[PDB]
Design a protein around this ligand. Structure first.
Ligand SMILES: Nc1nc2c(ncn2[C@@H]2O[C@H](COP(=O)(O)OP(=O)(O)O)[C@@H](O)[C@H]2O)c(=O)[nH]1
Ligand SMILES: [Mg+2]
Lengths: 160, 191
């Protein structure tokens, strides 16, 4: 009845990773999210169906976004991933493969298969097979496809 | 060897469906309580405190810096055994000599200063996080961690705890509002 899924949100700096989490978890959007002392990750609870409750942990890569290397204490036990880039910047889309490759080197399904990974084309208000289970044109400012991309990821996680 | 006895508090609610930003009060309650009881931080959390039981944000960083001084929560003194670990944390290396120095550093601090509170950048969030080092086991090479994000105390490997310390002491991850990051301890504890 109750499931706990840890999902990583990775990508380059300034693409909307923190904003996407804040929009989906807290229905909030802004350009400056100040820092406090409170949590190690975000939580979203979903009434997936009448017989299933899904607790979704959203781990913002945060301070590790400028360096692009993943530590075990961050990625351990991950079952899904969002790879986010900015469509208004060409260089941010280039490093999607560098994040996807680093992701594929650290975490994996119990059977060895790659974890479900969704590509997020953020700032959509303003295909190639590399291992992604899907893709969505999301917008943290306009709240577009962010909720669909989460259910799309949770569905692929529940398939396994 | 050295295992302290403190009450664990989760910053989740009873059902685990609500996540509060209560890492600051939970960690403060760990290092101040004794013998499996709960410290009286109710005067700070209940009195119209927006930072308590808040699902969005925690306590302000500068406001928490002043709160630690009021409750006699002190930073561990800059000793030579601490400086060697801090230099190793700058290089992000965990070889045998560093791991042995880490084992003696944690053992010494837990014996003489009791449980430690670690304030560090969050692993999966833009904010800061607080957790507690309450015990150590040299046989399995693990540390007893009181992390309010979990449902119970957890025995974590030394290198995983070492990577958590790296966030608080390496200049790569320290922001301009990370002046509160570091290891703290209860100023009234004595072995
Ligand atoms: N218009 C628009 N702006 C966005 C969107 N997502 C993020 N931003 C802006 O991008 C800036 C940086 O995004 P940020 O949350 O820091 O992304 P992060 O660095 O990956 O965590 C913020 O000031 C946001 O206002 C979006 O969907 N639409
Ligand atoms: Mg961010």
């Amino acid at each position: 009845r109750e499931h706990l899924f840890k999902v990583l949100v990775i990508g380059e700096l300034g693409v909307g990773k923190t904003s996407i989490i804040k929009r989906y978890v807290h229905q909030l959007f802004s350009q400056h999210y100040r820092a406090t002392i409170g949590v190690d990750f975000a939580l979203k609870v979903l009434n997936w169906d009448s017989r299933t409750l899904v607790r979704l942990q959203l781990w913002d890569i945060a301070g590790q976004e400028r360096f692009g290397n993943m530590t075990r204490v961050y990625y351990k036990e991950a079952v899904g991933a969002f790879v986010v880039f900015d469509i208004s910047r060409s260089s941010t889309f280039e490093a999607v493969l560098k994040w996807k490759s680093d992701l594929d080197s650290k975490v994996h399904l119990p059977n060895g298969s790659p974890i479900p990974a969704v590509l997020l084309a953020n700032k959509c208000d303003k295909d190639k097979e590399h291992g992604f289970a899907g893709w969505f044109e999301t917008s943290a400012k306009d709240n577009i496809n962010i909720e669909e991309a989460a259910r799309f990821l949770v569905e692929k996680i529940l398939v396994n | 060897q050295i295992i302290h006895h403190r009450n664990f508090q989760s910053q989740f609610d009873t059902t685990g469906n609500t996540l509060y930003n209560n890492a600051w009060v939970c960690s403060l309650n760990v290092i101040k309580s004794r013998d499996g009881n709960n410290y009286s931080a109710l005067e700070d959390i209940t009195s119209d405190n927006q930072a308590f039981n808040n699902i969005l944000e925690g306590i302000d960083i500068i406001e928490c810096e002043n709160l630690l001084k009021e409750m006699n929560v002190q930073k561990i003194p800059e000793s030579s055994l601490f400086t060697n670990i801090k230099e190793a944390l700058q290089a992000e290396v965990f070889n045998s000599t560093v791991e042995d120095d880490f084992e003696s550093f944690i053992s010494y601090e837990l014996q003489n200063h009791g449980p430690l509170m670690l304030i560090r950048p969050s692993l999966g969030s833009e904010c800061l996080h607080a957790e507690c080092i309450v015990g150590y086991d040299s046989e399995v090479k693990k540390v007893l961690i009181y992390d309010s994000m979990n449902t119970s105390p957890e025995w974590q490997s030394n290198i995983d705890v070492y990577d958590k310390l790296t966030l608080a002491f390496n200049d790569k991850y320290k922001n301009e509002d990370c002046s509160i990051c570091g290891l703290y301890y209860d100023g009234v504890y004595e072995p």
